[PDB]
């Protein structure tokens, strides 16, 4: 079964360069044309570049011409996208995709590329505990001032899965903020501990925050 795994995404300063990689398995890599398709914050898809099965014929979106280079290593089952002279318009989720002639039949999971002058900053994690009586209680944590996206939120290290709501990040002045809520039985809190776990890969940070009564 087809597997596509892109990597190399991250924060790059404008006018900078970045190399994206896409590992492929479960198919004859060299017998298929590969593409890079990016999803912009607007949610719009934009085809970026295509490389032929043998790597002889390369095609690029005009706005990306001369700045990007799509290449492939058939022996290494890896696809590449070397990017340079990056601009704000190049900020997107980058997907590598296997063709079925004109269609993109199989897609990867996606690698985020942030093009900004803003620096990497770890989140500050705040507990959201109710002010000083129902069958359920709602807790949460506020993940404030981070850059770039993404962050991950679990409750009790993955153990608490039901009643969990993780809200999309909102970008306010080069910093993201997100919140996550959990609804647990009233009888179990604070009797049993509820902790929110925050992972920010860009700054290699992880925060565990206990939610204590006010």
């Amino acid at each position: 079964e087809v597997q596509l795994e892109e990597s190399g995404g991250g924060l790059v300063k404008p006018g900078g360069s970045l190399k994206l990689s896409c590992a492929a398995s479960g198919f004859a890599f060299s017998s298929y044309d590969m593409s890079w398709v990016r999803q912009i914050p607007e949610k719009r898809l934009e085809w970026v570049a295509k490389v032929s099965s043998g790597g002889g014929s390369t095609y690029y979106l005009d706005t990306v011409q001369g700045r990007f280079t799509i290449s492939r290593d058939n022996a290494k089952n890896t696809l590449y996208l070397q990017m340079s002279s990056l601009n704000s318009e190049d900020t997107a989720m980058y997907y590598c995709a296997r063709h079925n002639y004109g269609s993109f039949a199989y897609w990867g999971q996606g690698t985020l590329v942030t093009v900004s002058a803003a620096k990497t900053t770890p989140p500050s994690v705040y507990p959201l505990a109710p002010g000083s009586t129902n069958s359920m209680v709602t807790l949460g944590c506020l993940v404030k001032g981070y850059f770039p996206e993404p962050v991950t939120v679990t409750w009790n290290s993955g153990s608490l899965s039901s009643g969990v709501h993780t809200f999309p990040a909102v970008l306010q002045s080069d910093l993201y903020t997100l919140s996550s809520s959990v609804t647990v039985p009233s009888s179990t809190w604070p009797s049993e501990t509820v902790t929110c776990n925050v992972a920010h890969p860009a700054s290699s940070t992880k925060v565990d925050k206990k939610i204590v009564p006010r």
Binding site: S103, P127, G131, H165, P168
Partner: protein, 212 residues
């Protein structure tokens, strides 16, 4: 070469049928493919070459058209069909996609569960103050959230975020955060979160008093 997709948004009750329109500026023969995109997931090929469906895709999905006009019809929409749909052209360079269509599942009206949170002593230490409001498991998506400080309505430093439609119960949740300086937070007593929603004539109010 421009691909124009309509409608942009679609609201479908389960059992009901819909169709998406994809329009090409110039004839693209049958070189038009259709995709589906669920939340936190990558696009997936639904129909290739205007009408050829893909192995594993429900028969309810039927692509049609040639030249400049193409359709994607879905018979008896299921809860699982929610998400984003895109047509793509492979006739000429660069390959283009349509603007997309957001397909939403209609369901029973659900009132939100509103919870108010005051600022934590850890944020107050850093000289900041966020008042957080969660509005979970409601339908329809349209909801009006207002913040009142000592009775006066406030929008500066308010930020909202809606989740995408829930896969299991087709409801929505939303988070509203009112951020102010610590010093300003200490100048006021009552902090309220007000939600106007179609499930009640009167808004849902959640209050916190800094003095209590």
């Amino acid at each position: 070469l421009v691909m124009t997709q309509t409608p942009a948004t679609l609201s479908v009750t389960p059992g009901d049928s819909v169709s998406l329109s994809c329009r090409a500026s110039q004839s693209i023969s049958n070189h038009l493919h259709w995709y589906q995109q669920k939340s936190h997931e990558s696009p997936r090929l639904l129909i290739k070459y205007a009408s050829q469906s893909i192995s594993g895709i429900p028969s309810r999905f039927s692509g049609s058209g040639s030249g400049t006009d193409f359709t994607l019809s879905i018979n008896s929409v299921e809860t699982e069909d929610f998400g984003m749909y895109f047509c793509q052209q492979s006739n000429s360079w660069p390959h283009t996609f349509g603007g997309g269509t957001k397909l939403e599942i209609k369901r029973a009206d659900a009132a939100p569960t509103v919870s108010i949170f005051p600022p934590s002593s850890e944020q107050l230490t850093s000289g900041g103050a966020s008042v957080v409001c969660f509005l979970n498991n409601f339908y329809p998506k349209d909801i009006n959230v207002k913040w009142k400080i000592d009775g006066s309505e406030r929008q500066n430093g308010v930020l909202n975020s809606w989740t995408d439609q829930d896969s299991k119960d087709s409801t929505y949740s939303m988070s509203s955060t009112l951020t102010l300086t610590k010093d300003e937070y200490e100048r006021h007593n009552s902090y309220t979160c007000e939600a106007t929603h179609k499930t009640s004539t009167s808004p849902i109010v959640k209050s916190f008093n800094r003095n209590e």
